[PDB]
């Protein structure tokens, strides 16, 4: 009934999907589709998620640049 096949990440999915809007206001499956080619959906199903956590790394590094310039918190 609930997902859990992208639930260790899914909390970032969202929380990188709304960093984006506010960053921007100021393939992947193409990957993902030959990793399978070339136990097994575990450990490997973990290799699939640092793609996506480093996107939203880089995302929210970027969005908190931009808010400690340019109408700085600090």
Known sequence: ???????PVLKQIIMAGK???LLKNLELDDVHDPL???TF????RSCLYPH????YLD?????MQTLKKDYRLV
């Open 19 to 21: 960093s984006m809007q």
């Open 36 to 38: 399978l080619a070339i």
């Open 52 to 55: 996506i956590d480093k996107q």
């Open 41 to 44: 959906e575990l450990t490997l």
């Open 1 to 7: 009934t609930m997902v859990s096949f992208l639930k």
């Open 59 to 63: 995302c929210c590094g970027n969005l």
